[PDB]
């Protein structure tokens, strides 16, 4: 019934700007505490920042590594939740979550200090920062057997064998992100040995982003 | 700030303690998440004793000095993923920040050895002026492999991209290791080798030109 969403997310590249917004309903929204947290792909959370409610005058507070270049608002007639990120970095890369954000405290003991919890999420928005430009693969047999899909940009890449006919033992392997900023990745089919001279193996290489249509066919050296 | 060991692996229906320090602990308590590829995280534990309903039971969490622990107490194969602490930065802050995370590895499938398949640059690619060497691994469990490079028994430590491992329909895991290298040392070494070592035992094979 708590229902959170995000949108904005998408490619940029370094020193662009970019709006993301996350909508809310099921629950008090204009009082609530809300929380951005990033997660760049393969590593860990970082908390990226708050908004508060009424009770503490709508105060921001942001990690130091987006102050200054960060700002978050809410339209509270609206639902709705901003974070603005402007001359964006690489490290800046990664999903982007909303969280409605409890607060732990017990007014009248003061045992504790207070402590933020993030109970509600919402599904996340991915945004890149990437200087890569439209890449087309470079398609290289790989002998007795498989084909190697070199150096391309954006995902993904779409590989078949024999035009859709060799399906059986076709392992095609996820793509590398390397630190040029373009993938690469592999499809590769085992067969009988016996069955090489008899049946041509080709490979079929699709990159839609680049036009890009290769069928290489593979065959001993 | 907040540390906690980067990977631990648990057996089914077994009890495994996840543990973040730091020094806000001392008098901050600390909230707790799971969380899955593709998956927003999911709050399992906060401040003194409270778990989310919808929440199962064998999620509990503990803290004592400078210290925080979330607990599973019969871990189950959904509960395979990465596990972050929370708290305050400092005292007299206003931020919070994340524990580095944990990687809590659920063993719900027999140890499998890699196969691993190597194969040499093409003819098209040195041609133009490129070589690659492509180490394929496959079928291994669980899903965590190091990948090492020798040219002539001598490590390469450039040029090399390795994917993290990603699970096969058979639940098994998948990695690819790429070398990149010009054609000058491509034929300057008589062989190249990969070394995939899974689970304290090494799988090496090995090209020429």
């Known amino acids: 019934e708590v229902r959170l969403v995000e949108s904005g997310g998408g490619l940029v590249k370094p020193g662009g700007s970019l709006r993301l917004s996350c909508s809310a309903s099921?629950?008090?929204?204009?009082?609530?505490?809300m929380t951005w947290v990033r997660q760049p792909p393969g590593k860990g959370l970082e908390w990226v920042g708050r908004?508060?409610?009424?009770?503490?005058?709508?105060?921001?507070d942001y990690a130091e590594s987006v102050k200054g270049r960060f700002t978050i608002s809410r339209d509270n007639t609206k639902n709705t939740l901003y974070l603005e990120m402007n001359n964006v970095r690489t490290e800046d890369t990664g999903y982007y979550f909303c969280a409605r954000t409890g607060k732990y405290y017990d007014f009248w003991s003061g045992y504790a200090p207070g402590e933020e919890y993030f109970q509600d999420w919402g599904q996340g928005t991915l945004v890149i920062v990437s200087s890569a430009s439209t890449k087309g693969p470079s398609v290289f047999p790989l002998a007795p057997l498989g084909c190697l899909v070199k150096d391309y940009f954006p995902e993904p890449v779409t590989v078949s064998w024999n035009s859709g006919a060799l399906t059986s033992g076709v392992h095609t392997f996820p793509a590398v992100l390397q630190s040029s900023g373009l993938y690469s990745l592999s499809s590769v089919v085992t067969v009988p040995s016996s069955s090489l001279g008899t049946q041509t193996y080709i490979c079929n290489v699709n990159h839609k982003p680049s036009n890009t249509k290769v069928d290489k066919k593979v065959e001993p050296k | 700030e907040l540390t906690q060991d980067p990977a631990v692996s648990v057996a089914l229906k077994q009890t495994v303690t996840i543990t973040c320090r730091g020094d806000?602990?001392?008098?901050?308590?600390a909230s707790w998440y799971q969380k899955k590829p593709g998956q927003a995280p999911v709050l399992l534990f906060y401040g003194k004793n409270n778990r989310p309903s919808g929440i199962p039971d064998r999620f509990s969490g503990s803290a004592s000095g400078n210290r925080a622990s979330l607990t599973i107490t019969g871990a189950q194969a959904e509960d395979e993923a990465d596990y972050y602490c929370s708290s305050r930065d400092k005292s007299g802050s206003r931020l919070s920040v994340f524990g580095g995370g944990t990687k809590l590895t659920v063993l719900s499938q027999p140890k499998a050895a890699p196969s691993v398949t190597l194969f040499p640059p093409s003819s098209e690619e040195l041609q133009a002026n490129k070589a690659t060497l492509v180490c394929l691994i496959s079928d291994f469990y669980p899903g965590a492999v190091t990948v090492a490079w020798k040219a002539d028994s001598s490590p390469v430590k450039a040029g090399v991209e390795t994917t993290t491992p990603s699970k096969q329909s058979n639940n098994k895991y998948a990695a690819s290791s790429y070398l990149s290298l010009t054609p000058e040392q491509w034929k300057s070494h008589r062989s190249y080798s990969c070394q995939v070592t899974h689970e304290g035992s090494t799988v090496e094979k090995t090209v020429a030109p």
């Open positions: 099921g629950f008090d929204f204009d009082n609530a505490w």
């Open positions: 806000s602990l001392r008098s901050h308590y």
């Open positions: 908004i508060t409610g009424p009770g503490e005058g709508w105060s921001v």
